[PDB]
Design a protein around this motif. Structure first.
Motif, PDB file in Angstrom:
ATOM      1  N   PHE A 182      45.610  29.493  25.011  1.00 55.81           N
ATOM      2  CA  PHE A 182      44.337  28.957  24.540  1.00 55.81           C
ATOM      3  C   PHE A 182      43.660  28.126  25.620  1.00 55.81           C
ATOM      4  N   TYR A 183      44.426  27.252  26.283  1.00 57.00           N
ATOM      5  CA  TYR A 183      43.888  26.440  27.375  1.00 57.00           C
ATOM      6  C   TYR A 183      43.379  27.313  28.516  1.00 57.00           C
ATOM      7  N   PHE A 184      44.170  28.317  28.906  1.00 54.75           N
ATOM      8  CA  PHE A 184      43.806  29.177  30.028  1.00 54.75           C
ATOM      9  C   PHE A 184      42.578  30.018  29.719  1.00 54.75           C
ATOM     10  N   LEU A 207      55.536  32.771  31.609  1.00 56.53           N
ATOM     11  CA  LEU A 207      54.173  33.154  31.246  1.00 56.53           C
ATOM     12  C   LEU A 207      53.245  31.944  31.206  1.00 56.53           C
ATOM     13  N   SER A 208      53.710  30.840  30.615  1.00 54.23           N
ATOM     14  CA  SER A 208      52.896  29.633  30.539  1.00 54.23           C
ATOM     15  C   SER A 208      52.711  28.999  31.914  1.00 54.23           C
ATOM     16  N   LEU A 209      53.734  29.073  32.771  1.00 50.54           N
ATOM     17  CA  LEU A 209      53.608  28.569  34.136  1.00 50.54           C
ATOM     18  C   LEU A 209      52.619  29.393  34.951  1.00 50.54           C
ATOM     19  N   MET A 216      50.061  31.083  33.696  1.00 44.79           N
ATOM     20  CA  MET A 216      48.740  30.723  33.182  1.00 44.79           C
ATOM     21  C   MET A 216      48.283  29.365  33.706  1.00 44.79           C
ATOM     22  N   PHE A 217      49.205  28.403  33.801  1.00 43.68           N
ATOM     23  CA  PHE A 217      48.871  27.081  34.325  1.00 43.68           C
ATOM     24  C   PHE A 217      48.468  27.146  35.791  1.00 43.68           C
ATOM     25  N   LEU A 218      49.205  27.917  36.593  1.00 43.72           N
ATOM     26  CA  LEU A 218      48.868  28.046  38.006  1.00 43.72           C
ATOM     27  C   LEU A 218      47.574  28.824  38.210  1.00 43.72           C
ATOM     28  N   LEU A 219      47.280  29.795  37.341  1.00 45.94           N
ATOM     29  CA  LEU A 219      46.002  30.496  37.434  1.00 45.94           C
ATOM     30  C   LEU A 219      44.836  29.590  37.046  1.00 45.94           C
ATOM     31  N   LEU A 220      45.033  28.706  36.063  1.00 43.65           N
ATOM     32  CA  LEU A 220      43.988  27.738  35.729  1.00 43.65           C
ATOM     33  C   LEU A 220      43.783  26.734  36.861  1.00 43.65           C
ATOM     34  N   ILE A 221      44.866  26.315  37.523  1.00 44.52           N
ATOM     35  CA  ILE A 221      44.738  25.424  38.678  1.00 44.52           C
ATOM     36  C   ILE A 221      44.003  26.119  39.818  1.00 44.52           C
ATOM     37  N   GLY A 235      46.202  14.453  33.068  1.00 45.56           N
ATOM     38  CA  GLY A 235      46.873  15.461  32.265  1.00 45.56           C
ATOM     39  C   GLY A 235      47.648  16.459  33.102  1.00 45.56           C
ATOM     40  N   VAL A 236      47.026  16.982  34.165  1.00 45.87           N
ATOM     41  CA  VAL A 236      47.710  17.972  34.990  1.00 45.87           C
ATOM     42  C   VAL A 236      48.838  17.352  35.806  1.00 45.87           C
ATOM     43  N   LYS A 237      48.740  16.071  36.178  1.00 47.93           N
ATOM     44  CA  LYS A 237      49.861  15.398  36.821  1.00 47.93           C
ATOM     45  C   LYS A 237      51.060  15.255  35.895  1.00 47.93           C
ATOM     46  N   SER A 238      50.833  14.911  34.627  1.00 50.66           N
ATOM     47  CA  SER A 238      51.901  14.864  33.637  1.00 50.66           C
ATOM     48  C   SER A 238      52.506  16.232  33.365  1.00 50.66           C
ATOM     49  N   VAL A 239      51.680  17.278  33.288  1.00 50.12           N
ATOM     50  CA  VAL A 239      52.209  18.622  33.067  1.00 50.12           C
ATOM     51  C   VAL A 239      53.022  19.089  34.272  1.00 50.12           C
ATOM     52  N   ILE A 240      52.576  18.760  35.488  1.00 40.96           N
ATOM     53  CA  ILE A 240      53.320  19.141  36.688  1.00 40.96           C
ATOM     54  C   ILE A 240      54.650  18.394  36.765  1.00 40.96           C
ATOM     55  N   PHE A 271      56.299  17.208  34.318  1.00 42.27           N
ATOM     56  CA  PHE A 271      57.207  17.682  33.284  1.00 42.27           C
ATOM     57  C   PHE A 271      57.762  19.064  33.601  1.00 42.27           C
ATOM     58  N   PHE A 272      56.929  19.958  34.147  1.00 41.96           N
ATOM     59  CA  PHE A 272      57.387  21.289  34.530  1.00 41.96           C
ATOM     60  C   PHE A 272      58.457  21.232  35.606  1.00 41.96           C
ATOM     61  N   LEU A 273      58.301  20.343  36.594  1.00 37.17           N
ATOM     62  CA  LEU A 273      59.299  20.234  37.655  1.00 37.17           C
ATOM     63  C   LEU A 273      60.643  19.750  37.118  1.00 37.17           C
ATOM     64  N   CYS A 294      60.491  15.922  24.378  1.00 41.28           N
ATOM     65  CA  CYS A 294      59.732  15.334  25.473  1.00 41.28           C
ATOM     66  C   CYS A 294      58.408  16.038  25.737  1.00 41.28           C
ATOM     67  N   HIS A 295      58.300  17.336  25.443  1.00 45.94           N
ATOM     68  CA  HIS A 295      57.005  17.975  25.626  1.00 45.94           C
ATOM     69  C   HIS A 295      55.990  17.515  24.593  1.00 45.94           C
ATOM     70  N   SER A 296      56.435  17.034  23.432  1.00 45.33           N
ATOM     71  CA  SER A 296      55.504  16.407  22.501  1.00 45.33           C
ATOM     72  C   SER A 296      54.969  15.094  23.056  1.00 45.33           C
ATOM     73  N   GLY A 315      40.031  19.223  24.162  1.00 45.37           N
ATOM     74  CA  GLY A 315      40.573  17.904  23.929  1.00 45.37           C
ATOM     75  C   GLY A 315      41.087  17.187  25.152  1.00 45.37           C
ATOM     76  N   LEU A 316      40.905  17.750  26.345  1.00 45.19           N
ATOM     77  CA  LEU A 316      41.479  17.155  27.542  1.00 45.19           C
ATOM     78  C   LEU A 316      40.655  15.999  28.091  1.00 45.19           C
ATOM     79  N   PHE A 317      39.412  15.839  27.650  1.00 39.01           N
ATOM     80  CA  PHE A 317      38.624  14.668  28.025  1.00 39.01           C
ATOM     81  C   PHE A 317      38.666  13.617  26.926  1.00 39.01           C
TER      82      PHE A 317
HETATM   83  C1  LIG Z   1      47.299  18.106  29.554  1.00 32.77           C
HETATM   84  C2  LIG Z   1      46.980  19.493  30.099  1.00 32.77           C
HETATM   85  C3  LIG Z   1      45.896  19.688  30.938  1.00 32.77           C
HETATM   86  C4  LIG Z   1      45.669  20.975  31.389  1.00 32.77           C
HETATM   87  C5  LIG Z   1      44.507  21.297  32.318  1.00 32.77           C
HETATM   88  F1  LIG Z   1      43.815  20.159  32.599  1.00 32.77           F
HETATM   89  F2  LIG Z   1      44.992  21.838  33.470  1.00 32.77           F
HETATM   90  F3  LIG Z   1      43.684  22.207  31.726  1.00 32.77           F
HETATM   91  N1  LIG Z   1      46.477  21.938  31.010  1.00 32.77           N
HETATM   92  C6  LIG Z   1      47.503  21.727  30.215  1.00 32.77           C
HETATM   93  N2  LIG Z   1      48.402  22.786  29.776  1.00 32.77           N
HETATM   94  C7  LIG Z   1      48.448  24.187  30.177  1.00 32.77           C
HETATM   95  C8  LIG Z   1      47.359  24.894  30.659  1.00 32.77           C
HETATM   96  C9  LIG Z   1      47.484  26.223  31.010  1.00 32.77           C
HETATM   97  C10 LIG Z   1      48.700  26.864  30.867  1.00 32.77           C
HETATM   98  C11 LIG Z   1      49.789  26.170  30.378  1.00 32.77           C
HETATM   99  C12 LIG Z   1      49.656  24.839  30.036  1.00 32.77           C
HETATM  100  C13 LIG Z   1      50.854  24.075  29.487  1.00 32.77           C
HETATM  101  N3  LIG Z   1      51.501  24.362  28.350  1.00 32.77           N
HETATM  102  N4  LIG Z   1      52.500  23.465  28.205  1.00 32.77           N
HETATM  103  N5  LIG Z   1      52.463  22.634  29.247  1.00 32.77           N
HETATM  104  N6  LIG Z   1      51.442  23.012  30.046  1.00 32.77           N
HETATM  105  N7  LIG Z   1      47.741  20.516  29.767  1.00 32.77           N
END
Ligand SMILES: Cc1cc(C(F)(F)F)nc(Nc2ccccc2-c2nnn[nH]2)n1
Ligand SMILES: CC(C)CCC[C@@H](C)[C@H]1CC[C@H]2[C@@H]3CC=C4C[C@@H](O)CC[C@]4(C)[C@H]3CC[C@]12C
Lengths: 339, 232, 277, 223, 55
Positions: free
Chosen positions: C106-108, C178-180, C182-187, C209-214, C216-218, C250-252, D221-223
């Protein structure tokens, strides 16, 4: 010289009419109705919620059959609803999506809409084809249309923001009477039950009683301190109520030519978008922009109920001809029928 | 507004033939379509119905599983595919438009007709009167009787009156009970309560002579009644 | 040596049970309170509350498994309880991790900006794509249940947790990768857009947000990779119960810090907790 | 339900389907409100990018744009400015060649001061808290040809800077952007345009892609 | 303007030659109307659910 003399004459006439309206002010409506039985609490509930619009509702109007209502919204749509079954009869796509008013003809054969395009568009519902087509595009106003009301199938009174109300002939397409007395933008309209005279609330904190056939203003009512957004006659036709941006509603008498009662509360600091009376005239329903409607006792200036339930500003409300239901429209794209 | 249908003719028994109707003059997509057939000596009989958007399709029990009805909305064409024809299908077929909302007038327009010749729990609407001798300038009360109460719980009595002039397609007069149709003079009127109905004409010219039909729209399959002829 | 490690992992499991219960209950509660008190609920918020309910179910499942193992080892040693716990865990965990991947999808699809035709086709059908993703990836669930039950039957015919853990860990890696991706493609999309808005439109984001996700992923993945590495090559049950609760707990906490609504609700909870005390 | 009631329900379902399809198509569109002064010059912008209010439709790189011009509305704008609360961006066109000029109505303010007052009213309005503004600085050629003779001290008396084109243009841009009292939930995009230039649609496309990214982040919701 | 000021004076004269009634009369008339239609007013006195069109 001459301008100063004319200003002095105008001030003298204003003081004369103020003294004349002071001389006919022996009692007050609050004092006279202080010994009548108050109504306890009006607990209305949402019966039908009309869904389908996607932008904010700016206007609704009921039909004379008390079942069909038309609504206007900024999505370029004009939906005609069957209120009993909650289903859509027509969905009219408008050429301009900036609609600010809608009207339903008393015969039910036509609907009207208008807004920032300065055009009153009349739509023929009952055609030989199954569609609803545009009958006329009345274009003679300079500013935005704020309200339109049908007199019959051939006449319609429009209020516009170019400090002008106009009476139209639909078959010819031209305007027959131009009502020109205001100073600010005219924002509201109300037709009398006998359909011979109408009131118009404008942005100069004034309401003017117009004559349809004669074309001249008869009375001017100056009590408010802000922009009047809503106006509605009493069912008797001898009084009307105004809703302004100074968080007050006022009841004006035509014969006494002044203000009888102010419907105000200290907890309300927000304007009035729509007013409507009950069938008996006892309840005055005012839609505010603190997200809910307030029911007022028209003879005692006391709140009788709150029509909470809208998530945004209540922009339009109307009471049916039989007085059974109240439909409130708001900016959250929903219409709710209360009973 | 015109519905021109073509097809049919002389077909052998057991064969197949497709009937097509072309619409020009109105929005075809917003109108439900009907097929009504009429035997060369008998009255009207409902065949099929396709809704707007083709979501609801109904058939008569005589032609169920052997007739197929379809519409072509971009081409404004209505189709009736017939399979395994018998000698009971020898009739003149009409295409009828019908729109349905609050206050609508269904069964308002009828097509011309296609002559098809084949070589060799329903509400019974009853019209007891037949071939009434009528002088002009008088008042005629054509009566209709129903085997079920046509008054629904919503206050609507679904009773439809039609007039078929000789050599012409039938024309709707009264759509719901006491509802005069568009283009119909004010001399016609209708009243009734439950199962017994009447159609009153105040004074009649030589224009309104023909066969008057009675139809119900309470529930499918829309049975008609045997017509009441009016001769001068 | 074994006893102190067992006690440390028991303490870790209790702490992360409390953390997961508090975080997922907070997410689902806040969404339920704002649902009953006449307020709007977004589709991201619906996916988040579905994830919260799934993770409450998973964390209570694993803590109940630990409580049964501690209080009643005789009941815990039976093969019927073993098969029942493994199958219920793999069903609930499959649905939870694929809900997390659906939120990432959904995010991607909502955020990223690519010029491809297939990407735009999926981008204007986000709800249909996430629903079809939830339905189609149940073949992974069916094949997972198949291989898990085959492993149970082979172990009781010849307790083979050294392959059951590997099977489950592989089946969690596919939605994680798959989620990783999608996250790297969004980055990559955001970096390309940022470089575009510095060369054409010189005049003019949630980095926290992306620093926390990074970060946590690491962590998550390295522990996963350590976990698998170890298993592939005595405290395995308690260690695997600890490792199986790390993501839903922890992901919550990561998801709370990164949603505006949940951050505002957490701030208001702290505010009235300090005011009441 | 009767047969006619069921058919009316089906008609309402078809109407709902058409409304949903039209709503999705409209939600994939970009709406722009074009604002400016009378002598600022907006007809050249509409010419480059293509009573009552005027709607201009144009498609640029698989995006459908809707540009609304409300400059002909000579009424109280406080009574219809909430109609544009949901809008992607506002395009504010300011000519910087009329710092030395004065209004044709009356002398009580400069043209640039009138544009600054209109910008302060629009940017800090209650209906445009999170609505970004695209700022065009039109007629840079006349501004370059007029800054040699007439200094910028006439418009802004507290300038105290070099009387070149670049420093004066940057000072005008900074003075327009310093009226953004919010500065935390909206952005101001600034472009320097002229008549003999076809690049403004690209600037609008880049700015509206930025606004679309920010709106998608807000909806997530990210902002 | 001379005509504009005269037009305002004319409307002021229109207000001047108006039979402004006592507030007492208007108040009593409004009270009477509300009392007269009070029964035929579904919002004031709620109708039973048998005769309620919205149920
Ligand atoms: C807090 C936050 C911010 C952002 C953004 F700022 F980059 F958009 N993205 C995520 N999440 C994801 C986005 C794409 C794919 C996978 C995840 C994911 N799923 N679970 N953990 N990360 N989260
Ligand atoms: C991505 C990775 C690190 C997640 C690791 C979680 C997996 C391997 C964990 C989490 C829950 C665990 C199960 C929970 C309870 C039992 C019952 C007992 O008789 C031991 C095996 C069994 C069936 C466990 C096997 C390992 C298990 C499935």
């Amino acid at each position: 010289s001459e301008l100063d003399q004319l200003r002095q004459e105008a001030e003298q006439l204003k003081n004369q009419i103020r003294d004349a309206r002071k001389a006919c002010a022996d009692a007050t409506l609050s004092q006279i109705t202080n010994n009548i039985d108050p109504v306890g609490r009006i607990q209305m509930r949402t019966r039908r919620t009309l869904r389908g619009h996607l932008a904010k509702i700016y206007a609704m109007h009921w039909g004379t059959d008390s079942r069909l209502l038309v609504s206007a919204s900024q999505d370029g749509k004009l939906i005609i609803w069957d209120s009993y079954t909650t289903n859509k009869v027509h969905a009219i796509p408008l050429r301009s999506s900036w609609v600010m008013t809608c009207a339903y003809a008393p015969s039910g054969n036509y609907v009207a809409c208008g807004g920032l395009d300065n055009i009153c568009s009349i739509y023929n519902l009952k055609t030989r084809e199954g569609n609803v087509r545009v009958s006329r595009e009345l274009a003679g106003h300079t500013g935005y249309l704020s309200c339109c009301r049908f007199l019959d199938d051939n006449q319609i009174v429009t209020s516009s923001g170019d400090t002008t109300c106009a009476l139209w002939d639909i078959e010819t397409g031209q305007q027959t009477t131009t009502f020109t007395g205001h100073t600010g933008d005219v924002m509201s309209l109300s037709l009398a039950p006998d359909t011979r005279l109408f009131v118009s609330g404008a942005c100069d904190a004034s309401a003017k009683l117009w004559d349809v056939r004669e074309g001249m203003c008869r009375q001017t009512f100056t009590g408010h301190e802000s922009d009047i957004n809503a106006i509605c006659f009493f069912p008797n036709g001898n009084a009307f109520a105004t809703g302004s941006d100074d968080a007050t509603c006022r009841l004006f008498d035509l014969r006494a030519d002044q203000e009888l009662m102010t419907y105000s509360h200290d907890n309300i600091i927000c304007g009035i978008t729509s007013v409507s009376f009950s069938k008996s005239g006892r309840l005055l329903l005012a839609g505010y922009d603190d997200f809910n409607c307030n029911v007022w006792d028209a003879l005692k200036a006391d709140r009788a109920g709150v029509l909470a339930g809208h998530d945004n500003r209540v922009s339009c409300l109307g009471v049916t001809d039989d007085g059974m239901a109240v439909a409130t429209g708001s900016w959250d794209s929903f219409l709710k029928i209360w009973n | 507004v015109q519905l021109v249908e073509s097809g049919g003719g002389l077909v052998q028994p057991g064969g197949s033939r497709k009937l097509s109707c072309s619409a020009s003059g109105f929005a075809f997509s917003s109108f439900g379509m009907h097929w009504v057939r009429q035997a060369p000596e008998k009255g009207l009989e409902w065949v099929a119905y396709i809704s707007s958007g083709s979501g609801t399709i109904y058939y008569a029990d005589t032609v169920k599983g052997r007739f197929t009805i379809s519409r072509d909305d971009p081409k404004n064409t209505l189709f009736l595919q017939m399979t395994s024809l018998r000698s009971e299908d020898t009739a003149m077929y009409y295409c009828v438009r019908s729109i349905y909302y609050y206050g609508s007038s269904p069964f308002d327009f009828w097509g011309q007709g296609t002559t098809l010749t084949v070589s060799s729990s329903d509400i019974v609407m009853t019209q007891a009167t037949s071939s009434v001798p009528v002088t002009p300038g008088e008042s005629v009360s054509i009566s209709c009787r129903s085997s079920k109460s046509l008054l629904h719980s919503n206050g609507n009595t679904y009773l439809y009156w039609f007039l078929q002039r000789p050599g012409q397609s039938p024309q709707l007069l009264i759509y719901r009970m006491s509802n005069l149709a568009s283009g119909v003079p004010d001399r016609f009127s209708g009243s009734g309560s439950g199962t017994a109905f009447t159609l009153t004409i105040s004074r009649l010219e030589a224009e309104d002579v023909g066969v008057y039909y009675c139809m119900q729209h309470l529930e499918y399959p829309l049975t008609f009644g045997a017509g009441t002829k009016l001769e001068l | 040596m074994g006893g102190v490690i067992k006690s440390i992992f028991t303490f870790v499991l209790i702490v992360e049970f409390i953390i997961g219960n508090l975080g997922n209950s907070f997410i689902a509660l806040v969404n339920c309170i704002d649902w009953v008190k006449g307020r709007k609920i977004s589709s991201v918020d619906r996916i988040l509350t579905a994830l919260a309910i799934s993770r409450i179910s998973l964390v209570w499942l694993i803590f109940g498994s630990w409580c049964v193992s501690v209080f009643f080892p005789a009941l815990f040693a039976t093969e019927k309880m073993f098969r029942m716990l493994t199958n219920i865990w793999t069903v609930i965990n499959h649905f939870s991790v694929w809900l997390a991947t659906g939120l990432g999808t959904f995010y991607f699809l909502k955020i990223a900006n690519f010029s491809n035709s297939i990407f735009l086709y999926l981008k204007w059908r986000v709800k249909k794509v996430v629903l079809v993703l939830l339905l189609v990836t149940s073949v992974f669930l069916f094949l997972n249940i198949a291989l898990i039950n085959i492993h149970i039957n082979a172990s009781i015919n010849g307790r083979f947790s050294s392959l059951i853990v590997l099977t489950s860990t592989v089946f969690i890696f596919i939605p994680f990768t798959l989620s990783l991706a999608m996250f790297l493609l969004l980055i990559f999309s955001m970096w390309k857009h940022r470089k575009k808005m510095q060369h054409t439109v010189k005049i003019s984001r949630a980095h926290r947000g992306v620093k926390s996700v990074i970060t946590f992923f690491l962590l998550y993945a390295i522990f996963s990779l350590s976990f698998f590495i170890s298993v592939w090559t005595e405290n395995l049950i308690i260690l695997s119960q600890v490792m199986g609760m790390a993501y839903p707990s922890c992901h919550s906490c990561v998801l709370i810090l990164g949603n505006k609504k949940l951050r505002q609700a957490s701030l208001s909870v702290l505010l009235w907790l300090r005011y009441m005390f | 339900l009767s047969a006619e009631d069921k058919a009316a329900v089906e008609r309402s379902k078809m109407i709902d389907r058409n409304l949903r399809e039209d709503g999705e198509k409209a939600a994939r569109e970009v709406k722009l409100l074009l604002l400016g002064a009378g002598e600022s010059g907006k007809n050249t912008i509409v010419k480059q990018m293509k009573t009552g209010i005027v709607e201009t439709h144009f498609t640029f790189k698989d995006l459908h744009f809707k540009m609304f011009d409300v400059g002909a509305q000579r009424s109280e704008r406080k009574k219809w400015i909430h109609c544009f609360e949901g809008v992607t961006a506002i395009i504010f066109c300011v000519a910087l060649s009329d710092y030395d000029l004065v209004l044709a109505e009356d002398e009580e303010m400069n043209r640039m001061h009138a544009s600054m007052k209109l910008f302060d009213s629009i940017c800090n309005n209650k209906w445009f808290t999170d609505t970004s503004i695209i700022l065009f600085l039109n007629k840079k050629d006349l501004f370059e040809e007029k800054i040699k003779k007439s200094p910028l001290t006439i418009c802004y008396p507290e300038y105290a800077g070099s009387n070149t084109y670049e420093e004066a243009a940057a000072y005008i841009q900074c003075q327009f952007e310093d009226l953004n009292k919010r500065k935390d939930t909206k952005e101001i995009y600034t472009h320097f345009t002229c008549s003999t230039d076809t690049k403004n649609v690209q600037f609008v496309f880049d700015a509206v892609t930025d606004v679309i990214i920010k709106n998608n982040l807000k909806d997530c919701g990210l902002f | 303007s001379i005509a504009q000021a005269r037009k305002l004076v004319e409307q002021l004269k229109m207000e001047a030659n108006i039979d402004r009634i006592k507030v007492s009369k208007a108040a009593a008339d409004l009270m009477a109307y509300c009392e007269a239609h009070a029964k035929e007013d579904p919002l004031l006195t709620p109708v039973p659910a048998s005769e309620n069109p919205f149920r």
